[PDB]
Amino acid sequence: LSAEDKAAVERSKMIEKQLQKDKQVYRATHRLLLLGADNSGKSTIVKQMRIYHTSGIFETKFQVDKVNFHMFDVGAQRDERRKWIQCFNDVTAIIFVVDSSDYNRLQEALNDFKSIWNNRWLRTISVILFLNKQDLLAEKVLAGKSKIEDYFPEFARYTTPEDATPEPGEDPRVTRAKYFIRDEFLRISTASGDGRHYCYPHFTCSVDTENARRIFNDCRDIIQRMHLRQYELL
Amino acid sequence: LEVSISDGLFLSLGLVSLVENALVVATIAKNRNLHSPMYCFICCLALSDLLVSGSNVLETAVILLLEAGALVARAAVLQQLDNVIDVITCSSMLSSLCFLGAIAVDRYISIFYALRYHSIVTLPRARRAVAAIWVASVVFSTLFIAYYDHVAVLLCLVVFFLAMLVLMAVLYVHMLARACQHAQGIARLHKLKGAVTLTILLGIFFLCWGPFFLHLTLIVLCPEHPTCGCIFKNFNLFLALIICNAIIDPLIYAFHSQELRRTLKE
Amino acid sequence: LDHXRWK
Amino acid sequence: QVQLQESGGGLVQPGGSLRLSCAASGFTFSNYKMNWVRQAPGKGLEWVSDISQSGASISYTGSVKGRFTISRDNAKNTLYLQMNSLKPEDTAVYYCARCPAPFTRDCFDVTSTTYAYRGQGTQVTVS
Amino acid sequence: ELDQLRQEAEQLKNQIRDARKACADATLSQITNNIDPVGRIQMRTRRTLRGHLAKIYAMHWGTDSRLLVSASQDGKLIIWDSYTTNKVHAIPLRSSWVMTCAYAPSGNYVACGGLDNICSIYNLKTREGNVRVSRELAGHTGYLSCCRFLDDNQIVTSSGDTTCALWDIETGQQTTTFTGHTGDVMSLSLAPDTRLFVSGACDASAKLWDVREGMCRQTFTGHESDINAICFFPNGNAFATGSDDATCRLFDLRADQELMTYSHDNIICGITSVSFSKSGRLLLAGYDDFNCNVWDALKADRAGVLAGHDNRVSCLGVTDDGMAVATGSWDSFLKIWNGSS
Amino acid sequence: IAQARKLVEQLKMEANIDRIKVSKAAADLMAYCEAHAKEDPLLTPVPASENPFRE
Ligand SMILES: [Ca+2]
8 A cells, every 4th residue: 555545544543543532422421312292391301400511402411420411302393203213212211201280181191101112113212201290280189170080080999009108298199199190101111111121200390409310310220220131130 | 089080071171162262252353343341351251261271172182192102202391391381271260260350340330330331441441451461360370380389379379269259259249139129129110030140150150160279278278188188189170170161151151142142153 | 291280 | 095084973962872984995904003083172182092903902091991992894994983972072073093104013193283194084073 | 165175186186096097007027027037136245334333324325436424323424435444534413313414426515414403514625624514404394304415506305394495505595395295204316317306205105396396296105104215216217115014116207106016025124225226127125124135126026135234224325336235224334235256 | 275275286287297108117117227237236246356345
């Protein structure tokens, strides 16, 4: 080889050195898809990640304990999503936000969850499940004006699991509704999650300060479950 | 009680180990996609076992071919030939033990510190650790086979095996406790294999390396007593056990991966 | 020469 | 062309019964999971029920679970919704909708505002 | 009232189906039954271009048959010398979620876009010697699924908002927009003489557009499900279509209907990319099963298979010389394939 | 009023176009394929001395 062919190899090696530097930032950053209906508080969550800091996609960067997170909020897309969702087959988690107070829309949220969960390409991706707007849920169940039994008829035969850990002063009414919704999503997750992926339910309110901590702990446990399964220790 | 090993079995067991180790190394030398801290430590383990099995095959072949006549050499040369083949064999064992520890530490730094994993462990640092392990393996193997008749070498070899056993046990038992916590979390939402895996890893490690350093220990603690004599008289089986370990570890660590199973199936 | 050492 | 001729809707008194029928054309009907969707006036679209390729699974919205039942006939490419205990809140346009891809169980997009593989639909009125 | 229009459209559709049936005198598989078989086409992976970090989502050959653009959702465009594996450029993208790239026939400009809904065109050879964005084309209201250069200054673009658009690059504005798809338009294909392009758009249908008249000339409707991939036949009078049906179909722009359907019941997974060979007799199709298949486009026999990938094939293209087939997949590698006698 | 006016307009714009027999289209495609069978390296592999992708 000679002349420009050697310079071509020299340029290729300079590129390789930059690619080896970019690979470190790529591997050290954890990518998340923030997903949720227009009534879900995904925007007020994004606006309160800034404590930790026509466009078709939005990018939120935040850090916990010197781990860097990239969280993507899907912007000015059309409502059909079966094609673009395939881009996120290699994120760490889906953060799925739900308005627990809209019983009339909880069913479409569940069908959206079924669709995300059983998709062929997201079959590896765990779901972090923010059952948001718990204050509105509590006020609604306490007021009692709107029932849940006529939206979900089996609620009347559901009884609070010994798994429950109610906060101080939570009425059994509110606790039973809350955990009923939680188990409504878990029934989907547990029906077809063949060990490859899991979901992580969290009761949350938009004002919650600790949600970055939750995401940090859920990503930690996702990667631990992944490697302990890869090592057959799990 | 004495178990006959000295002919044919020892050689063929070494040749089988040579095949399995080389297949691991070849499957990593092709298919560059796998070249990573995880599988580079596994390849370095398989290389070390490859040199264990090769150098023992050479030792038993040379000794056999010196036997029944055939090849002849003056003993003042042959003793140094023996010394060199021992130094290569001992280096490849101490390296194999260190790479078993390195796999333990890599997995540990991949369960705990799971997020910062690719900032803590990197392929540059993997390369540096592998080189340091081989350099140390030769410098100690040379020193040990020079001063071999001094007690301190045997005692330090035993202490080295005991420290490596403690390191592996502590790391792997801590990882299994964490796996059991995850299994309980899953059960709480959804409403043994870990123990099998860990007991295979440590059982094979302790069973196939342990009795040799026992032998060395008894050479120090009871050099001349009949109560120890049936340990000394079965030494060739303890070397055969180390070659058996060199056969089992590829099946525990490398062909454990499906992608390696595919790239071996071709 | 022997297989191995300290036999 | 892929088309779905929903055909059975009409007016009933409360407690009445109707049997919606969809005739499917232009695709290998046995390969596709299928749904019924409805839209009450002034509301968006909502999912009613689901049937897999061979009936090996059926699912319903909680507002319907005992009141409507899906059936399917792969031999003549028809999809049914037998409605047995109609109520005023069932007053809606009902749309037969097909999943996008065969041999797959993620029913994406079937409730979307525009969606290709969904019929023109038929209005049901419960007086 | 809407019903009168809907029934008039119904009767026009019946008239169009009748017209297509009237000219459907003989199927391609009858006419080609006398043609000699292609034989077992088998190709070696000559070169593997490696060093993307994430899944490769799009690629495009240059007009020189030698340089590759490749786009990966790690946010890099790499330009490769396929004769040497040399990385002649690597461009850090504004947003990682690239879904399309394109490489101009002038060779001088490269474009990409995706889930940002913006088409970014890069000048490769400025006087400063370093790559930079020359324009950002913004105005699509959905992800850009495909783009293709007509000229040093004109780019056609395809979006999830059901529209295509033709942009003047220098002024950065839409000259025309193409409308009447009912779903996400997934792939473009420009005719060899750049007056027409076809697009398929997540309904049963592919549409032929006139770049100068701005209007849809013809609508093809054979497929059962979303058309992912589209490619003109080299004569420019037919085009192939790949779909989640797990079928490819060939349409003729002048008989206005299907000629042939490529479908093997041993495979039940969607088509991800489609390309013809230079002669047009080989149709190359990429699949969700981690594979590509080679079809005799005249006889619908499965001539060959390129089983070299660890994840779904995402992009596929022959050089304008016909000299090699490039394949990219989510396993982060591009594999370059050829035969040797 | 409703947008179905544009759909029916496009259908009538597409109805009146000319349509050759399918047999003639097929003949044109196979005549092209056979007219370029020697020129296609994937169909007719050129010897290794003149492939840039290996020697
Ligand atoms: Ca010796």
